[PDB]
Amino acid sequence: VHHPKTKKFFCKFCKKHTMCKVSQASRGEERHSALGRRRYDRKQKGFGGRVKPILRRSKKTSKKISLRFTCQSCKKATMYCLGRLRKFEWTVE
Amino acid sequence: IEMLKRVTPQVAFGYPSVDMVRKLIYKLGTANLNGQRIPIADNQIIKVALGHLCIESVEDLAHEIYTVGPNFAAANRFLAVFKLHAPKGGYKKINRAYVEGGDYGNREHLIDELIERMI
Amino acid sequence: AKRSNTSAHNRSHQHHRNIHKCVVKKLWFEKGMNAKFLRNARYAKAGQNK
Amino acid sequence: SAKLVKNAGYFSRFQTKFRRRREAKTDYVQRTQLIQQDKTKYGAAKYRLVARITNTKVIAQIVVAELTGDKTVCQALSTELPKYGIKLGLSNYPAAYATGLLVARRFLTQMKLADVFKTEITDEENRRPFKVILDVGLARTTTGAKVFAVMKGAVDGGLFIPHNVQYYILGGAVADYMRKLKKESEEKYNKQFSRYVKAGITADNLEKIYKDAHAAIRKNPAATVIADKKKHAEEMKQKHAPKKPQTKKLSFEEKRKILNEHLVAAGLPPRK
Amino acid sequence: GRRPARCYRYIGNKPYPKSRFCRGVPDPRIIRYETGTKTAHAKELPICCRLILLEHECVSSEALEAARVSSNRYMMKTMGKDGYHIKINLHPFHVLRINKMLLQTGMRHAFGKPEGLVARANYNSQIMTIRTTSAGLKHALEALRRASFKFPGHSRVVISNKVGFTPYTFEQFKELQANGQIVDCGNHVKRVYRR
Amino acid sequence: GHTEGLRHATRYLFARKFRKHGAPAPSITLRTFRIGDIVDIKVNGALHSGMPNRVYHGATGIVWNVSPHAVGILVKRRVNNHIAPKRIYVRTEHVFPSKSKNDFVARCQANLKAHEEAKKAGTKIALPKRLPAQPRASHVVKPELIQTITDAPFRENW
RNA sequence: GAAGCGGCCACACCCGGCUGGCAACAUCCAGCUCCACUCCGAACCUGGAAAUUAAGCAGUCGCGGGCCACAUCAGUACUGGGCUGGGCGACUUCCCGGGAACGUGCGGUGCUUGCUU
RNA sequence: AGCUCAGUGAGGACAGAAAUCUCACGUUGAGGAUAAGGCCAAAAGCUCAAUUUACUGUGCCUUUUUGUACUAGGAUCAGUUACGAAAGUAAGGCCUAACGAUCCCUAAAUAGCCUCAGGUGCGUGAGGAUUGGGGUGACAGACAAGUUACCUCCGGGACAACUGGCUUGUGGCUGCUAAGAGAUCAAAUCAACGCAGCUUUUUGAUUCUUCGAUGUCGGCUCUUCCUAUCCUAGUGAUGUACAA
RNA sequence: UAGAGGUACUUAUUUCCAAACUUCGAACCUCCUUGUUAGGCAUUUACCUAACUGGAAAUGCUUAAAUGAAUUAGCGUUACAAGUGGGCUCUGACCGGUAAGCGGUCAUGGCGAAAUGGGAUGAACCAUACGUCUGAAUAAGGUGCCGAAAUGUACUAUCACUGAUACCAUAAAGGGAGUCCAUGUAUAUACUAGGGCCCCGAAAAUGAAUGGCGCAUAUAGUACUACCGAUCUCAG
């Protein structure tokens, strides 16, 4: 599906509608200073294989596209979620 | 009557004459007082229960049945259910109606012929 | 292996051993109802006692 | 010869439209959203200014909906305007505005609120104005239309009609169109403005008459307080009775007489 | 080939016609339901002669075509395609089914493919007619005696009072014709309702 | 293949009678409701916003909330063992004023008409009440048409 | 009687005849501004008033189509209880209760809420 | 806001069964993303124009409480925008499917709200509360290939192979009817297309009995029973001359 | 399905149909109401209305008149815990199957956990659901003898190596100057509309079972009394 690159939207902090440059959301790669990760590093050391599971039987090939409505008055992003999409385009017209 | 239409296979019933309504209450009549199933014995039983409703003695109670006066259901509730023995002719067919050569359901006037021999 | 899936033979029997009528406490349900109505219904009660 | 549409199977199946959809006078999608009021306001009236323009007459009303039927609270009608000044052109644009002033000022003098709400209104510790909605109808809502001429009369009269918006108003645009026929064509001036010449008001007078029309409407708005209404309604039947009576119904006896005389020609009498 | 028709006599389901849903259906054995002088009249062939069924059951399509051929070939032999008019007043719409069987998976996914067409009769349903003249009323009864042995159960052969295949008695027919209320279509009688 | 959908097994529930298709009349929107009022839920099949469930078709309840387009209705569904209360919200175009009480309210006002007017003359009152249909008084009957019904001889007529 | 506004939404619809226009509704006449035709003043819009009831509209007629109503259809079809009733069966007498439809016959073809001349 | 579709009927240079144009009838049979069923005509369809309410925040209700959740939908309140002359309408798609826990990671704050236990500490860094995403289709959600005739154990007639039982489609046997074969002639003898039965000597179907075991195919040897009779006893028919 | 009328279609018809067709539409069901109902008065509100001596809602006061279907019945609420989570089945309705003592559902009943009597015999069918005893009169079902009780009275059919009491323990299509009863016509007689009972159709393996003996007015129907008979009913 296509989507506008700018549209009007309620800025939650400014408390009114205002036009905002939208963009696709950043999937961050995990840092190793994370507490959860640290537990994993220490626990993975020693013997007795891999410890926690990873999901082998993973069927579905789809992903809910979260957008990032970065405001221009407020300067603050507020994340909108669409449904689940196979492809995602920008509108050119 | 519409209640009796549902239960017609389970019961025999009809319209008793005054000599039959009499003879039940003098012989077999009992008063259900405070859930006790007491035998009728003497008229001071039924003065105490029913005197405020202007029914003094057993003649006035029997009258209140067969004329169906205003305090009928007081007088009927006062009477405990009668308990009869199985009659000295027998009778033909439980499971057919009287109308089709049997027993159950409405027999109008000839209930008096049945109750004589049940008593 | 293949045993029965369901039955309703003696559902009726069990229900009638006891169909108890659950009675409502009050007809108003103040979690629901219009807030704008109930907002004013407070200021009716609050003003009266003074 | 192809399929006969309109069998018995068609007409048995056929649902009708209501009535004023068939006669083609009301949009019921308008009307159902014109009438409606929130259930938290319960039995409350809201008024609606009807303003339907026939040929000759500009009609204008104020209406409340009820379950039995609609009820006019006050009415005004452009054939009244001869009394106030305006003799001719009773579906002009300035005639439509003049009825708008009558519907306002009569309605406010019935309610006894004439000293309040003198001018247009344009906000607290002050009495709130009458909400009166525009019912247009099936007339198309374009700019410079004669429906919104009646609106501007009602707003300048008194009533808060909600909207988002003095030429055309004191007889302009009529008066210019007189001059274009008068100056050039001359023949066409006799066709177009026959009655005007007859009075004859002239091109110049249109501006003058309307201002003193708006003076006299604001001074003495209500009129023709007739009673009782029953004996008024009886007189109108005699006054406007066709000289020739309408054909009246043949009775069931004389129908069967005429049926049989037709059936005598083709044989097999009589019966029905 | 076929099952014995004692399999598919009595009716142990809802009726199951040829449609979108049934799909893979073979067409019935019957094509012609009606033979003899089809283009005739009510007045030309007044005498009528019916075969009534005295059971509530299924009649096969194979029975109804056996009954037509045995009817025609007797009436052809005697009088010779002139007077008579044969008609069949069952149409087989009910479709039968089979579980097949013919290793094996029996009684699992038991629903089965359609095998053949059938007609569902009702107690006193006429399943045949012969309309004819008074000369060959004798021959019509002897035809329907032979056609009755084709059908399941037992079945009465009856001389009707009413004219043709019309629902009018001989007494009523003269009164309406005389009245002029009734009219004649190419075949059969069309009433005049005076409307 | 039994399904537990919202609008399931409602082919003929939300059908629109016959020659009663289209939107309803605007008299329906002009009607008013109050808290405590008895109302019956029967559905317009056309108007899709703010329906009830399939189950509360033909189901009497009492109004408890009222809101700009819609009415909160309290209705007693029978669960398994017990009769639960159910707080519905539903639009006014699926909701009508029920005539359950109009027998009762007619009698109370008819009684007060009798109880007052007895005292106005006064005089002395007979007490009216409802009573099931009762066995008849004796009376005498002369007819002057008496047919004699008999069974005819059977004839086939086909 | 006519008109604007409506209520139940065919006893009001659909085909085809006949009789009416004092005002009113309408056809109609004209195109300059308001604005209107993805072309056209046909429509929509605006300004008229010469002549007409031909059409719409109103009333009315038709062994009219449909719709509505009552009576027959019929104690039929089907159906809730009951029988150590019948019947190889399929189905079905009878007893105590409820009770259609299509068709046909005759009738009818809008009844008036609030304002106005 | 304006308009009416599918289709049928007549027309119209080249024009044909189908191009574009015109009038007339046209209750909706077209179309409304898709399954099937509802729903819809000055619309919910088609066209044109302007738009971002497919928006933000907490409770509530229904499906469903004999089991409370998520999904989906619904009525509001508190905001704010869009559009319209306005009443109003909009919280996606006319209505019913189109999707998902803890833990962990991750993103949202112009860079905010709390904590880092001697400091009402100073940078970095980390951890929290609140709101989405990354995913489990076995869809209330372990992270997971075979073989055993070398096999073991627990139990199961809750479940098969095996005799019996019920059933008779299939197999076998027999009626009723005749449409003709049979030179001629339906019935000496065959017998269609049909219809109605019987049988448990075939094989199915089923799972009632037996899994703390009724020794399972055939042949050999001996007994008795049934007749739906091939021969022997006695009888009738014949396309029975004799015989066969 | 099969003709007629119009210019293969089409206007009316006709034979005969639909679990996933509906222009009509039952029975059986289902849900709500049936004692407090009409008002009047004046405080409260930031809500609604153009406006308040209005609306909406809850707080109190009070003006009138009564307990306003039947039959029955005390009703309400909480805590703790057992066993259970293989069911089977009569009579009707139903899906799949040729059908099954087959598989899967529905409504009331039954068994499981329910004796006793009756169906010779049987979990389930009929009567009836039970303390220990003594009687009376009954129910289902029976009354030649086994076996308690009429080979009862009144009235019609039946000859067959045959018939004989619900569930039930099998028999059909199709035949018969057997006998009894019988419909319509024609001339004592010919031609048949049929109905019962009886016969044929009707063949399996140990010797064999209306329960047996046996019966032939102890077989098949019909009506009315008397009588025997349960742990039911009634009396002590």
The neighbour count for residue C17, using CB atoms within 10 Å, is 7
Strand G contact nucleotides, protein CB < 7 Å: 1-10, 12-14, 18-30, 32-36, 44-50, 57-67, 80-85, 89-92, 94-97, 104-110, 113-117
CA distance F64 to chain C (A): 6
Which residue numbers in chain D precede an interruption (C–N > 2.5 Å)? 122, 165
Which SS3 state, helix, strand or coil, does residue D30 take? helix
- Write out the two tokens for B18: 């005054």
Is the separation of the CB atoms in D151 and D161 below 8 Å? yes
Backbone phi, psi, residue B76, to 5°: -75, -45
Taking CA–CA distances from F92, the nearest residue in chain D reads D39
Q: Which chains touch F (3 or more CB pairs under 8 A)?
A: C, D, E
> Chain D contacts of E194, Cβ < 8 Å?
268, 271
3+ Cβ–Cβ pairs closer than 8 Å linking D and B: no
3-state SS of E93-129 is CEEEEECCCCCCCCCCCCCCEEEEEEEECCCCEEEEE
Is the separation of the CB atoms in B55 and B75 below 8 Å? yes
The answer to whether the C-beta of E7 is closer than 7 A to strand I is yes
Give the determination technique. Answer: cryo-EM
DSSP string, chain E: ----TTSSSS--S----SSTTT-SPPPPS-S--EEE-TT--TTTS-EEEEEEE-S-SEEEHHHHHHHHHHHHHHHHHHT-SSS-EEE------EEEEE-------TTSS---EEEEEEEE--TTEEEEEEEE-GGGHHHHHHHHHHHHTTSSS-EEEEE-SBSTTSS-BHHHHHHHHHHT-EEE-SSSEEE----
Which of D162, D94, D110, D170 lies closest to D131, judged by CA? Answer: D162
| Cis before D228? omega within 30 | yes
Inter-chain contacts counted by CB atoms under 8 A, chains D and F: 45
Which of A34, A32, A39, A21 lies closest to A78, judged by CA? Answer: A21
Which SS3 state, helix, strand or coil, does residue D75 take? strand
Residue type (1 letter), D57: K
Q: What share of chain B is helix, strand, coil (3-state, %, to 5)?
A: 45, 10, 45
**C1' of H10 to CA of D262 (Å):** 37
- F16 reaches D (C-beta below 8 A): no
Q: Which burial class, exposed, middle or buried, applies to B64 when counting CB atoms under 10 A from its CB (0-12, 13-18, 19+)?
A: buried
Half-sphere exposure of E66 (CA within 13 A, CB side): 12
Residue B39 pairs with which residues in a beta bridge?
Answer: B30
- Select from F34, F37, F82, F90 the residue whose CB has the most chain C CBs within 10 Å, as the one to mutate to test that interface: F82
Half-sphere exposure of F139 (CA within 13 A, CB side): 5
Question: Parallel, antiparallel, or unpaired: how do β-strands B105-106 and B12-13 relate?
Answer: parallel
CA distance E175 to chain D (A): 15
* Resolution of the experimental structure, in angstroms: 3.2
Place of tokens 């023949």: D187
CA distance B23 to B15: 15
Is the separation of the CB atoms in D89 and D131 below 8 Å? no
Which of E82, E77, E80, E92 lies closest to E38, judged by CA? Answer: E82
Place of tokens 């629109």: F16
- D19 reaches E (C-beta below 8 A): no
3-state SS of chain F is CCCCCCCCCCCCCCCCCCCCCCCCCCCCCCCCCCCCCEEEECCCCCCCCCCCCCCCCCEEEEEEEEECCEEEEEECCECCCCECCEEEEEEHHHEEECCCCHHHHHHHHHHHHHHHHHHHHCCCCCCCCCCCCCCCCCCCCCCCCCCCCCCCCCCCCC
- Write out the two tokens for F143: 């007819």
**C1' of I74 to CA of B49 (Å):** 20
Question: Parallel, antiparallel, or unpaired: how do β-strands E34-36 and D59-64 relate?
Answer: unpaired
Residue E114 pairs with which residues in a beta bridge?
Answer: E97
- Write out the two tokens for B72: 């009928």
Residue E184 pairs with which residues in a beta bridge?
Answer: E189
- Write out the two tokens for F18: 């016959």
**C1' of H156 to CA of E108 (Å):** 24
Backbone phi, psi, residue B64, to 5°: -65, -25
Contact E158 F157 (CB under 8 A): no
Which D positions 210-269 lie with beta carbon below 8 A of chain E? 268
CA distance F3 to F24: 32
- Write out the two tokens for D266: 């083709």
| Cis before F123? omega within 30 | yes
- Write out the two tokens for E116: 């053949």
C-alpha E124, offset from chain centre = 12
Backbone phi, psi, residue D50, to 5°: -75, 140
Long-range contacts of B77-81 (CB under 8 A, 24+ apart): B77/B32, B78/B31, B78/B32, B78/B33, B78/B46, B78/B49, B78/B50, B79/B25, B79/B29, B79/B30, B79/B31, B79/B32, B80/B30, B80/B31, B80/B32, B80/B37, B80/B38, B81/B32
| Cis before B89? omega within 30 | no
